[PDB]
Write a structure and sequence with these properties.
heterotrimer, A: mainly alpha, B: mainly alpha, about 0% strand, Autophagy-related protein 19 (chain B), protein transport
Chain lengths: ~25, ~25, ~30
């Protein structure tokens, strides 16, 4: 359902966060 | 970098939009 | 740190999703 899709998106954004840097 | 940051910020706004729809339905 | 707002928003969104997930697990 849409909720489970959002969980996946959220988990992908957590991965992307780990790569993010301001340097 | 800046492009990744921009996309991330936009995806965040979309995520908040999406969660709001689910929250309003549940409430 | 410069990423702080984004991280906080992500944590808050997960907090909200956890609440929806727990509600559904019961509701079924």
């Amino acid at each position: 359902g849409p909720m489970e899709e959002q969980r996946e998106i959220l988990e992908q954004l957590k991965k992307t966060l780990q790569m993010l840097t301001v340097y | 970098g800046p492009h990744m940051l921009d996309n991330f910020m936009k995806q965040l706004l979309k995520l908040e939009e999406s969660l709001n729809k689910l929250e309003l339905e549940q409430k």
